[PDB]
Amino acid sequence: TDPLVLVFVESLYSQLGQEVVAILESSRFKYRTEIAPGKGDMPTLTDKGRGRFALIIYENILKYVNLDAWNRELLDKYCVAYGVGIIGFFAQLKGFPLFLHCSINPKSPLLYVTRPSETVFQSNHSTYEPVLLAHATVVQDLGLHDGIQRVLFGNNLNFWLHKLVFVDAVAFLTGKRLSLPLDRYILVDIDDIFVGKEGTRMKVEDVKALFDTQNELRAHIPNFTFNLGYSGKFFHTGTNAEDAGDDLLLSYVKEFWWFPHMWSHMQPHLFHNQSVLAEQMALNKKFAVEHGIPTDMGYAVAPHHSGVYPVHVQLYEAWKQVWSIRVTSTEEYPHLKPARYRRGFIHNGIMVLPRQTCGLFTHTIFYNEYPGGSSELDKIINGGELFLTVLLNPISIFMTHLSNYGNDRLGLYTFKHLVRFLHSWTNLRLQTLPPVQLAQKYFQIFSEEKDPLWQDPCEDKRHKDIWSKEKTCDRFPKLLIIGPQKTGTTALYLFLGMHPDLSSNYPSSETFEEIQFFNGHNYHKGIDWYMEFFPIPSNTTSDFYFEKSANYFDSEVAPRRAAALLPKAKVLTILINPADRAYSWYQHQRAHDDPVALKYTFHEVITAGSDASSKLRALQNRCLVPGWYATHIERWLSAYHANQILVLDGKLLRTEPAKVMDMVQKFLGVTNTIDYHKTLAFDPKKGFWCQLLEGGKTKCLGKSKGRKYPEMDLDSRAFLKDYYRDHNIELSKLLYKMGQTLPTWLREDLQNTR
Ligand SMILES: Nc1ncnc2c1ncn2[C@@H]1O[C@H](COP(=O)(O)O)[C@@H](OP(=O)(O)O)[C@H]1O
Ligand SMILES: [Ca+2]
Ligand SMILES: [Ca+2]
DSSP states (O other): OOOEEEEEESSSSOHHHHHHHHHHHHTTOOEEEEEOOSSSOOOOOEETTEESEEEEEESSTHHHHTOOHHHHHHHHHHHHHHTOEEEEEOOBOTTSSOBBOOEEOTTOTTOSSBOTTOOOBOOSOSSEEEEEEOOOSEEEEOSSSSSSOEEEESSOSOSHHHHHHHHHHHHHHHTSSSOOOSEEEEEEEEEEETOOSSSSSOOHHHHHHHHHHHHHHHHHSTTOOOEEEEOSTTSSOSOHHHHHHHHHHHHTTTTSEEEOOOSSOOOGGGOOSHHHHHHHHHHHHHHHHHTTOOOOSOBOOOTTOTTTTTTOHHHHHHIIIIIOOOEEEESOSSOSSSGGGOOOEEETTEEEEEEEEOSOOTTOOSSTTSTTOHHHHHHHHTTSHHHHHHHHOSEEEEEEOGGGGSSSOHHHHHHHHHHHHHHHHBOOEEEOOOHHHHHHHHHHHOGGGSSOOOOOGGGSHHHHHTSOTTSOSOOSOSEEEEEOTTSSHHHHHHHHTTSTTEEEOOOOSSSTTOOOOTTSGGGGGOHHHHGGGSOOOOSSSOOEEEEEOGGGTTOSSHHHHHHHHOTTOEEEEEEOOHHHHHHHHHHHHHHTTOHHHHHSOHHHHHTOOSSSOHHHHHHHHHHHGGGOHHHHHHHHHHHSOGGGEEEEEHHHHHHOHHHHHHHHHHHHTOSSOOOHHHHEEEOTTTSSEEEOOTTSOOOOOOTTSSOOOOOOOHHHHHHHHHHSHHHHHHHHHHHHHHTOOOOHHHHHHHHHHO
8 A cells, every 4th residue: 555644633723633743744654634524525545456545543533433334334445455554542432342431561562662661441352452551541453353453542642652652553553664763863963162251161070071971871872972063263262260171172082073163153144255254164174173173074063054054155165165064954944943844955065964952052051041941851851852853753963052061061961861761761772873974874764855945045034044145035037937848938938028027037058048947957056046047136127037948847846846946936838739749849859950850750759669769768758748738737736826827828829929918918917018919910921920020020039939841640640639638638627627718729629529
């Protein structure tokens, strides 16, 4: 079955359902949230002979017990025939020999992570085995009465142990398909070393406590080493007891790990010149080399995470120039909140990891100086945010600062009690790796996060504050012409730039008006490369910008990338008859001296068998798969709303573009509506519509657009009639669902089918 988790929750805002979804999202468990049927409608469970869900979860198990008989029998038949368990949440239960009304069963088969060292369901039957005892709050049914095992919880996922039991139940009922290895990796980053004016710095007792705590935690976690964020300027600037305490930290230079972390603790996004930023880091490197600090760890952290997300190219280049940084970390990708959504990415040769916080901040000096009270730190340690981060994430980077190792040394005490809690309650093997080894482990576990998902910095206040002030905000287009190719996109592009309120981007060096940002390696070039094609918004200028790229239509990664950077953009896809589109795109390749289009006739290209060249298969894929209009539009329907997408008839644009452009302007909502009837004039020599300049002169497209070639033969037309027949029927249903008018060729093709 598919690894999707079928989630039934009473409403879209219930606390128990959101807690389950939060656990599944933290564990990268794919889920499909649905409204629980109160004798209503059961969604489809099997597709193409195989089930679509490996595990179902029920936040109100009474909606399964009191389920309608036809749906209940369908669900029970599905779960028996595919081995899918039921996680429930909550007199005798109806349909089961179980009555309804904290220790741990040590021999329970649920236990994969939970260590048994430290409403109830009770009756007399052997079809269930209890997991948590009170009689039995959490019971694991053995499937000896119904047929398939189910785990029923007597309470919510509020307690930390119940979350630990829940992820064990997810692992067991799936068959250890939706689970993680017991190996856990932790790296603690101590920030702002040698930062401060008076007080809260290293004394001799603070360094000795830091060294001793690292030694004793090395017995718990093998090779556990602290990472120190030094800062060379605020050296020997504290009290007399703190001048020696800073000097005592250089005696233990071979006992810790160090990362550069700025010369004078200034945000790198304030550095609009790279060379002065590199000279700052060279001063910090000179300090580290002189004091014996190692300069080969390959890891660094910006003082406010300024310039890692959004990308300040000067920070990335200076890190690789002065330090050869390979790993950094941030808490800004994709957003600061919630922390469970934080991912990593690899950009510009630097692997970025999601940095987390242990709850200890810069202002946290004393135990009672911690905000919320000293019990809030103990709550976070003993089954709070600390424990849940280690449990649900394989790799964690925890943030701590200079003040967390001061008078009370809360950084020591917090990680002391956390590791004791982890090894007394879990079977997890805690490890500590160097940040290079830690990052490689992260992108081997999560290989889908190796590509970044760019966003607009000015849509988030936190991202705007750590963005360079020399970069303007709305330098992004509002209209995307996605294609497909050879449908008339250049004529639509050339007639849109004539509008005074609308501005087109600068042409590229090779791809000209096409940027091809969202569908290839140009996405990895960054958003600052993308902003160079669109002029500075200024004030007294046309603030509406558009760009065309015909390869965005059929691309799979382009819609989600375009929706991430430009969620408010308008999508313009134009369609002609796909038999004609395939033929024109075939003849266009012949006109560009493509050697496999010139070697094979159009009938041979479309009748290409599997036992042929890969060049022919690439051309056949290029001719036919973009003609699957229903497939590619549905990809863009997953990313953009229906009202942000307009589907034009390219044959209508071929004949009457003036009414087409009126539909475009009412789609784009312009103010200076151009009368294109007097502005566009049909050119008999060209065969298409062109400009009507002053004096009767006409400005047409080049020879590449609107070519002339012999007509398609009847055999190839007959093949493209039956090939696209189910595609056009799906396209007709799709365009009817969107509320957009069917094209003239589409309605004609349905009439020929009838
Ligand atoms: N005013 C116009 N000028 C040029 N081509 C136009 C046009 N209106 C529609 N077209 C069509 O645009 C197609 C090319 O689409 P694109 O500009 O995206 O490459 C041409 O197919 P052909 O060039 O095979 O005759 C032509 O039929
Ligand atoms: Ca800092
Ligand atoms: Ca800080």
